Design a protein around this nucleic acid. Structure first.
Ligand code: GTP
Length: 1073
RNA sequence: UGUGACC
């Protein structure tokens, strides 16, 4: 409940020259008392009278009613920031050392010196691209500095470490003034011409870093990074994190977790000696020297101190630095420079070709329907992203322009222009438009925005490849329902004194031109073999068109902007934008390592315990018939790099016996770590989400970092959410939503009142509001209706339906209509009509919560029903599992030490239900978990129709609608649907073993019937309540259930009429991965 | 309609 209090201290801090608390109640009488109170407050304020008396008079409203929002009548002129900042600007400003960066524009020169004229200006190289101002970030940091002004002991030492760092930011800013943003949170030329180009973005990164400072070590790290980053905008992060790839090979393993035959973590008390050849030490020194040469002093010393003993117990500091390096910001270069960097492959191509065959051999031989109707599959999978060119489009009676793929496909069909039989060229005549990928620390990479003929031609085939990977272990990122803990356990498994692990970053090879030939060629060579495996006209064409995308790309040309011009240059490298990007890259990276290992075997004899490809890295674990020595490592290592060298691949290749470090994860001293470097106050690019959506994403980002090891003060995050979620009524009237409004599980939820704990309404007022917010969840869009009525549109839907099903549609047809009406959301005009409506609705809602005919059931109600039938009692769970993920907070780690962890994802889509598999054997359709949910609950006769309507043959449609399997699917679907509504795969929960024997102990559930659905939810509701109590209290409880039998039948019914909820919080989770 | 692929 502390959010609602912190909110006022904030407004009372920002504004000084009124606040009007607005309450509400599910109880009639009390509500009028709220209504009255509101009035009297406005009136008294409109007379400069003290509200102190009303607060006493309506003491009842302050005590029993629920705080809905807070009115903020502030009369100034968005200044204050200017004023407030001086106090902290006493230090000497920083002076950009314009000699640190290669490309001239990467140096913090004065904006003007980079863009002499307003027409040459572009924020494209510094745009924070976030819907929150620098002005407000500042305000937020001072608000906090004030609140913790009179702190003591250690808390003060945190303030003191921060007070300093913030001076640097303040001093340096004051020297130029505070950059003012516009309605779109953009920094324009007039305001930027004076100040250093990178002023704003650097401010954002520095503030975000200083606010995540606690220990003296944080302070030392923030300080350095904040100072060097004001001048270095291109190698800092790579410099500060490069060492980490060597450090993991130093720490000794004294007990670690491994993967067993049941694919689950299991403790192994073993010892593995870290064996490091001297040469490695030179490499690490050159890296430490390089850091030094760039100004770095403190950070290098820290790694140097740690290097005396190299204890996994003091390693935490090394990982802290590794995660901090990223908070410097994104390296945003110019499209041109980004694109500018770009006989013994016989073995390498042969592998790509064979691997491509293995994945489609069966599918092709058996005339897989997916492959036959590949084109139709491509259409249903189509997104609403860019096609490349902004086309003029006529809908109904409106001529509008769009670049959207979903739009171009419709318009093109309605004019005989739709022709997926012909795969457009991407050469000099039709140059590929470009997109960009920005990341912190690494160089910018370009992206192909190919025409839709390319997606359709690849979609089906790629999906068959991803399936082969799903059950192939070499493909770490696609195998089973596995999470990262499984990959962690696979490495540590064979680690012993007679084996060495070999990790390798191959990100530079994928972009190499030396690669583009063996690649495309290898695939094409495979597609040919596959074609000689069938005679199916459908299969050969879908397979042929795929061959065409590879040939058109062999010699592609690109449209690289160079100011305000678009130069067309011949691109001879494999960029990414295809449907096969990830799959193909995985196939390639794997073929590569297989080639290297095979070559080096001619010298040394080893055993291949495991080979793995995961993203832009690949690794292996080798076993020798003798004990490994520092000299054996050196020899293997040299021969490996040498092998990679003869292939002209600039890659990082290290060899150790204890750890590995790759982009997604790194294993030091038998433990697992995940870089905690998601930026907070700077984004890669601008999307179309709202501020509210961004508030939730910030919090979501806060959570993941926090779990990963980088914690940013929760009071700062909360402050940011107050700013971003506010809504202006006028110029002097700003509305701030209450904790109840922002944390309740509704369509407007932004974060959990308590970290790692998702609450659900357990009071009438909470329920009251919960139902209200839903009343206005989806808003209308005139523009969207118009186009949803246009011929070109209805014909598209209709044409898609007539190709898919045979008998009648409706359930499915109503789906295809909407799925298409939604894709029109990427189209800004529609996106804007929506928001505007949401704001007005939300404006009148936080002013007098409307009514609602409810009649809709949500997971909240189900739980609110159950709650009353459980008896709690103090219990005890000893800690038994050793920590394998060191950075986890303490309250989250405790849970795992008691109940354990898991290495899988709980099926939450229903893809494992027989019906879903049935519909897959005969249809290209893909029903969602929510559609399966409604379908499976229909009358037997109706299900039989749905199946046959989608192409499922009667013998099968009938053999199912009765069988034991059907009755089963019913349970498994609901089970999958519920795990989905509870976010059992996100946040903290994704870590916990919900089937832990230890946890099951604390749940006592006497069966008073035997009706699966009810038994399921009662157990889950208990497991969640028990875990939440532990997350918040550090102790355990036992839950006893005495749920009536007469009640179980009522519940069972509610269960099948649950409604899913959509919200920023919900969408934030999906946005994660 | 300051917008920029696969997922
Ligand atoms: N910062 C600030 N703004 C005020 C104050 N009083 C009124 N405002 C209004 O808030 C605006 C301040 O500039 P903005 O950039 O829009 O700041 P904001 O809209 O309040 O919040 P952000 O967009 O996150 O910065 C002005 O347009 C004023 O109309 C005040 O005391 N401080």
């Amino acid at each position: 409940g502390k959010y609602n209090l912190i909110l006022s201290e904030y407004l009372s801090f920002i504004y000084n020259s009124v606040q009007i608390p607005i309450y509400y109640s599910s109880n009639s009488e009390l509500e009028n008392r709220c209504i009255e109170f509101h009035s009297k407050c406005l009136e008294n304020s409109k007379n400069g009278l003290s509200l102190r008396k009303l607060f006493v008079e309506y003491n009842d409203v302050i005590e029993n009613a629920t705080l809905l929002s807070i009115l903020s009548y502030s009369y100034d002129k968005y200044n204050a920031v200017e004023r407030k900042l001086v106090k902290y600007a006493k230090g000497k400003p920083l002076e950009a050392d314009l000699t640190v960066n290669e490309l001239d524009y990467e140096n913090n020169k004065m904006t003007s010196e980079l863009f002499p004229t307003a027409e040459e200006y572009t924020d494209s190289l510094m745009d924070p691209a976030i819907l929150t101002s620098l002005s407000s970030n500042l305000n937020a940091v001072m608000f906090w500095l004030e609140k913790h002004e009179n702190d003591v002991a250690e808390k003060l030492k945190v303030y003191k470490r921060r007070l300093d760092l913030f001076t640097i930011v303040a001093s340096t800013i004051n020297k130029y003034g505070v950059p003012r943003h516009n309605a779109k949170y953009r920094y324009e030329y007039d305001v930027m011409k004076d100040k250093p180009y990178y002023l704003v973005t650097w401010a954002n990164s520095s503030i975000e870093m200083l606010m995540s400072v606690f220990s003296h070590d944080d302070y030392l790290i923030a300080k350095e990074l904040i100072v060097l980053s004001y001048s270095n905008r291109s190698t800092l992060a790579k410099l500060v994190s490069s060492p980490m790839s060597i450090l993991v090979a130093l720490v000794d393993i004294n007990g670690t977790f491994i993967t067993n035959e049941e694919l689950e973590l299991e403790f192994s008390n073993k010892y593995v000696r870290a064996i490091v050849p001297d040469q490695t030490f030179d490499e690490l020194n050159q890296m430490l020297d390089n850091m030094r040469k760039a100004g770095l002093v403190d950070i290098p010393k820290m790694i140097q101190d740690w290097l005396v003993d190299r204890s996994i117990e003091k390693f935490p500091l090394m990982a802290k630095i590794y995660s901090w390096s990223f908070h410097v910001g994104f390296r945003k270069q110019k499209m041109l420079d980004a694109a500018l960097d770009q006989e013994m492959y016989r073995e390498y191509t042969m592998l790509i070709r064979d691997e491509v065959v293995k994945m489609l051999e069966e599918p092709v031989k058996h005339d897989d329907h997916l492959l036959r109707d590949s084109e139709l599959a491509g259409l249903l999978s189509m997104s609403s992203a860019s096609n490349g060119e902004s086309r003029q489009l006529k809908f109904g009676r409106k001529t509008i322009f769009s670049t959207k793929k979903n739009m171009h496909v419709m318009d093109d069909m309605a004019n005989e222009r739709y022709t997926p039989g012909i795969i457009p060229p991407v050469n000099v005549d039709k140059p590929i438009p470009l997109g960009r990928r920005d990341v912190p620390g690494r160089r910018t990479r370009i992206i192909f925005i190919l025409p839709y003929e390319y997606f359709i031609a690849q979609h089906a085939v790629v999906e068959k490849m991803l399936i082969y990977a799903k059950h192939t272990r070499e493909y770490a990122e696609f195998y089973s329902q596995s999470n990262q803990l499984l990959s962690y356990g696979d490495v540590t498994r064979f680690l012993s004194n007679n084996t060495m692990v070999l990790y390798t970053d191959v990100s530079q090879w994928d972009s190499s031109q030396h690669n583009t030939q063996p690649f495309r060629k290898g695939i094409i060579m495979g597609l040919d073999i596959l074609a000689n495996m069938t005679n199916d006209a459908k299969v050969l064409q879908t397979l042929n068109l795929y061959k065409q995308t590879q040939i058109n790309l062999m010699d592609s040309y690109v449209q690289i902007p160079d100011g305000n011009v678009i130069k067309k240059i011949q691109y001879g490298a494999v960029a990414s934008g295809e449907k096969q990007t990830k799959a193909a890259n995985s196939i390639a990276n794997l073929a590569l390592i297989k080639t290297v290992l095979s070559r080096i075997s001619n010298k040394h004899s080893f055993a291949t315990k495991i080979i793995r490809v995961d993203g832009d890295d690949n690794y292996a674990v080798l076993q020798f018939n003798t004990e490994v020595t520092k000299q054996m490592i050196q020899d293997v290592s040299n021969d490996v790099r040498e092998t990679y060298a003869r292939m002209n691949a600039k890659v990082k290749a290290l060899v150790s016996t204890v750890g590995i470090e790759i982009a997604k994860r790194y294993i030091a001293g038998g433990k697992i770590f995940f870089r905690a470097g998601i930026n907070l106050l700077n984004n890669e690019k601008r999307g179309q989400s709202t501020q509210w959506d961004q508030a939730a994403i910030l919090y979501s980002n806060y959570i993941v970092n926090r779990l990963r090891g980088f914690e940013t003060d929760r009071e700062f995050i909360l402050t940011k959410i107050m700013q971003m979620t506010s809504v202006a009524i006028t110029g002097s009237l700003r509305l701030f939503p209450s904790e109840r409004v922002l944390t309740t599980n509704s369509t407007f939820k932004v974060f959990d009142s308590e970290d790692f704990i998702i609450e659900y309404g357990t009071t009438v007022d909470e329920v009251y509001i919960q139902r209200a917010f839903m009343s206005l969840s989806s808003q209308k869009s005139g523009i969207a209706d118009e186009i949803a009525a246009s011929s070109t549109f209805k014909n598209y839907v209709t044409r898609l339906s007539e190709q898919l099903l045979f008998s009648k549609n409706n359930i499915v047809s109503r789906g295809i209509a909407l799925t298409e009406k939604a894709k029109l959301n990427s189209y800004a005009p529609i996106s804007l009509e929506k928001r505007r409506a949401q704001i007005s609705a939300l404006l009148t809602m936080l002013q007098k919560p409307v009514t609602f005919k409810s009649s809709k059931i949500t997971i909240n109600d189900i739980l609110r029903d159950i709650k009353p039938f459980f008896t709690v009692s103090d219990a005890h769970l000893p800690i038994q599992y050793q920590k394998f993920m060191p950075t986890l907070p303490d309250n989250v780690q405790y849970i795992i030490q008691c109940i354990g962890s898991r290495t899988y994802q709980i099926e939450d889509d229903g893809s494992k239900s027989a019906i879903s598999r049935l519909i897959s054997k005969y249809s290209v359709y893909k029903p969602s978990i929510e559609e399966l949910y409604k379908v499976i609950s229909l009358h037997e006769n109706e299900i039989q129709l749905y199946l046959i309507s989608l192409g499922i043959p009667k013998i099968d449609a009938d053999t199912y609608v009765g069988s034991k399997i059907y009755s089963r699917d019913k349970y498994r679907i609901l089970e999958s649907y519920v795990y989905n509504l509870l976010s059992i795969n996100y946040g903290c929960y994704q870590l916990f073993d919900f089937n832990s024997p230890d946890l099951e102990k604390l749940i006592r559930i006497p069966f008073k019937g035997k009706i699966p659905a009810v038994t399921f939810i009662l157990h889950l509701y208990a497991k969640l309540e028990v875990i939440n109590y532990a997350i918040k209290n550090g102790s355990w409880i036992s839950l006893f259930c005495n749920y009536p039998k007469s009640e179980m039948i009522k519940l069972w019914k509610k269960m099948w009429n649950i409604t899913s909820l959509r919200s920023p919080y919900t969408n934030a989770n999906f946005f994660q991965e």
